[PDB]
Amino acid sequence: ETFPIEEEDGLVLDFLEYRLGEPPFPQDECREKDLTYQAPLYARLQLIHKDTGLIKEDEVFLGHIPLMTEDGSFIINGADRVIVSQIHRSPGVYFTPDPARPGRYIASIIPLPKRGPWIDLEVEPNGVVSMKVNKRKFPLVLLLRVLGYDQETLARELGAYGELVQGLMDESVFAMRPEEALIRLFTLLRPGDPPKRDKAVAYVYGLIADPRRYDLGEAGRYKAEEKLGIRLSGRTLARFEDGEFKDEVFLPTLRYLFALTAGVPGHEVDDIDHLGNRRIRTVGELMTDQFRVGLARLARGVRERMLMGSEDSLTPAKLVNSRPLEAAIREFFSRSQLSQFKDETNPLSSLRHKRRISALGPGGLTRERAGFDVRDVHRTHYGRICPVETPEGANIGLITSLAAYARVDELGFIRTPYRRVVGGVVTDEVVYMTATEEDRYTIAQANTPLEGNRIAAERVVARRKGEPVIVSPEEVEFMDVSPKQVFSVNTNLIPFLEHDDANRALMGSNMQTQAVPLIRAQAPVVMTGLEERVVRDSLAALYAEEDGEVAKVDGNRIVVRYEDGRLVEYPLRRFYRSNQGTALDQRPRVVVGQRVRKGDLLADGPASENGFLALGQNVLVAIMPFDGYNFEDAIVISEELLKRDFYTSIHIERYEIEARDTKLGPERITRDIPHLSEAALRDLDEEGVVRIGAEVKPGDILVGRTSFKGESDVKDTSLRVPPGEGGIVVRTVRLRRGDPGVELKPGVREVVRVYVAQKRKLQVGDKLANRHGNKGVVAKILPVEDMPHLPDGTPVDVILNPLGVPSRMNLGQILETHLGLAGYFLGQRYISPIFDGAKEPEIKELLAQAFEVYFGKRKGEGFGVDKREVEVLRRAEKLGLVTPGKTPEEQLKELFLQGKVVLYDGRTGEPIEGPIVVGQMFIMKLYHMVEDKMHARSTGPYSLITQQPLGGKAQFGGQRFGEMEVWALEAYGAAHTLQEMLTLKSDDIEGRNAAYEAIIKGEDVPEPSVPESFRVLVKELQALALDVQTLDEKDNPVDIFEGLASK
């Protein structure tokens, strides 16, 4: 499109082909050296002189283009990034009701973003039709005259529809020639600018007819062709042929508008939120748009050089400056809101990040302006966008997720699959449909009963344009493929989802992404059957490429001998820091001499157990209150979890320092540091860097550095461990000037990085969650002997408060607990797909078998029923849980089939007065760790202008005492406390110095003074030429500057 770069009346530069080379550096080197993983782009071009025909052909280097990795991300400046897809209004022709005036309609023509102006057509109340473009109302009949339309042509094309055609006609315009009409239109659109003929021609051609300026996309072309029932030749609204304008879209659009206004059947308004009217721009399209912008800037530069350069001695290399293209690509991949720091807390986090759909971004919607209509779940979202997974705050409904079976077509429209039904017989043919195509049929639910593959049900539940209906099997045309297709990948991992309220299912879906990998992670006892596919598609684990046999196994290597006879070595990623500080390592799961078929697992990735997604741990839980320690979502856990290293995670931190050049002399990284005893320099090596394996605590030196003090001869500028951090030093990396592939900033001699590792155990203040939206902070860790225990001596691991269930209405966790109890005693795991899985009777049969094991084990040893069990059974007999007249064993089994057991209190030995729900639950540790959040400050750095404390834990900052905190202090009448907050603790410089000195001297703090921010306010008001004066009671000036600003 951009080439050929014709020069005005000459030289012509024409594009021939391009190629992409191989990357100069591999992915891991790019990560280590802070480089972009990219490939060089070469374009072969030829310069032809118009008259001579002398052709100079050259291949010119255009720069580098970033390369997507195998998993679908990019390495930009050494950091992993994901481009988020953008949802927006599809280009084309739309017709909407006029909001101000009923019975009238507005027609809209919309091109691709930044590829033309939106064009409005509207029937004015006085009868003349008017088109608005670039905020300029003017009559459409003028442009129609320009396009070459006569009175007879318009009259015969639109005579049928009544008086609208009479309102169209205007004899003043129609007496002019298309040249006069062109000049007249140009003078309406550009008032004042001299009306040269070729100038007007160029302006109007660029408005609607230039393919390099206006562009209805392929999507817009398709939508217009299907809506208007006409055929486009290109992507513009009009053509410039034989020196004159030919219409393409305007008359069909106006005919549709008139037919709609006349109530003619077969003409309808458009739903702008319909998923047939909204499309997805993916990574390729966004990158190509930025590439086109850069190419246009390059074309401008080429034309300038063609004008200025010596036409005799010119080549394609000399004409082309590739800086704008590189700048556009860098800008897109480094500053675009849609280019995001990849979320890699666990593999599911990255997979979910790659499937995100955003309505925001450049050219998108605004978070404050989006109201109700865009945040809603449309009926056409069914099978295309998950109705559950979305953020909870101000971004709700603006960021969503692609449905599991959905596909984005070549035009950008999301398609979903349906099985074809013919004559009441469900077939294997699967058709992927857009929402518009889907609207034409009657689609049966996937849970329709079948005999063989014939619909064995007289009444079938179906959708007709989203409306639920009941139909006979004959009227059915298509059937859904699976319930899984309605929800996203994260929501598909919640078992018993049909028993959960949507809000808490949202919380569970979102919280699965914050799960931290654990060193003893397990797969859930109750699964939905999608864990293995999630692990496989994340490229976190290692699988055998072909059938073969394993030759070498190591903690860092697996060598496999395939049946081809070729030895293949797979290195293992070990203790690698993710973007979020979690450690991602691969652990071999194969032995030497083992035979492996194709696709067999070789090594487990992070948060994986034998190829299954393993986000947390299966623990024994009891659902009961406990001494107020699980009050309002708090959680009580047993110390036995800590004893056997459950919920233990590994975290890695990176600390970086630089030695650069200074005017007072260069900095240097060295061990020779003044004014420190050898107790402070124990762990440093001979080069001034801490040794691998040393333990470091807050205040310890990591990298030694000395700087020239000056100040009218060296001083300590070393890197130390910040408060609240530390651990074991696991890595050190040094990058020096001149080293291959290193690109330091000017002046920086060298850079040193240190990687420090931590093994974090569960502690009070940590956050735990299950897959059903139940989240809570650990509030108490009890010794084993205090935990409630089963009659066989087994203690529970977790106690959850039952008050979290009734108002949250997430009953799926209860069914999960019952199935977990059955599996715990039967020693098995379960796959329970959503909306088609385990029901209550099956769980009851499994619980009956589990009770046979749980009780026959006791009966064999020669034990009857406990006295405490008899007392609890009496209480339950009063409660109506068991039927009177049965033996104690029968009543115990009756309780067990309800998921309840007799439980004993570890502190007293007496039983809990009622039976308690106990079972296995899958619980994950979340990335919100109290270690990373506790922060305090007495004094520290202050800001440059306001002289107030800085913000953030990293800056050793202070807490913000905002407007409503001040309101609360005022409402208490606590004047002196508020004055302390405003002056002695924030920006009264003399006041804070005096307060600190008085406190360390044992006295009480003095009275405060004027805060510095008010002096700044006075100075800024003087800069606006306003005289602000402070006065005493007698209206005389009071100098708050102590005399420093009076001449």
Binding site: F61, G192, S322, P746, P941, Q947, L950, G951, Q955
Partner: protein
Amino acid sequence: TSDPVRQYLHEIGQVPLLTLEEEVELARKVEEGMEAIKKLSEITGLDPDLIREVVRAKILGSARVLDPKTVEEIDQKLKSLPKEHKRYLHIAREGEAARQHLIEANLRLVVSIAKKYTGRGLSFLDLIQEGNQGLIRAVEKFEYKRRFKFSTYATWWIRQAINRAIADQARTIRIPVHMVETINKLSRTARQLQQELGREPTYEEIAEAMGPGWDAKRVEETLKIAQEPVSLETPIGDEKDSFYGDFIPDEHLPSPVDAATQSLLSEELEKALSKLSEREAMVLKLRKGLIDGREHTLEEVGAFFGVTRERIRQIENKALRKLKYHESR
């Protein structure tokens, strides 16, 4: 109303262009008016510049705001010219009018030249104004005797003015013109070398390609001084709540800990001196800059007490030993 570029273009287009006869006529009038100005300078014996300014002030009229009194007195002094000499004054007036018309008519060439310097640190109107300055220079320096067209001589001056203004005003931290040329040459050489090599060149390659007198260290320094400052108001994060300057600590003012340490140190020094004799403490304070900030020499302190420098030195050493004892005590 708004968009001053359109307003300026309209006002420029309101002035018609020139033909060869009109252009040569105006240039000849300008040159002959300057000759008349210098002849009047010889006749009256006064400075040529001042009479140039009075002629120009009288032409431009009251509307344009040296002052009215002196221009009036010298204008009347110009009315004492007998005959065959006031013709020079008429020629000078016509020449100044010709200069104004020449500039007004050739303003459009300035716009045509200046439209190809956008995106280099200066707005379009600023470039246009500097081009106008260069056009005034070209008008004054033009020689019609060479029969060359005016635009041929005007383009060079307009381009020079635009380039010089760009070198002078494009950067917040001003960099001299020769260093600006050096930076531009470095960038162009690096771009050509990258086009040849197919990758970003290293500093040694650029140093080799610059020529004699260039090493990699010099290229590094030159690239370092070419860095432009960033804004304190650069938004951090998506929400409009975090700025860059919010993350920058003040390193100038003393901290409360530092101020408390200094206050305690001053109190400790005062106590140590008050432990000594008052006379020797005063001598120490005078010599060590405690009474008046400034440090004295032995001669000055001795002159205060009317004693020699070495007596001051010896009593200061006795006070130093007393400080030794007190610290030990």
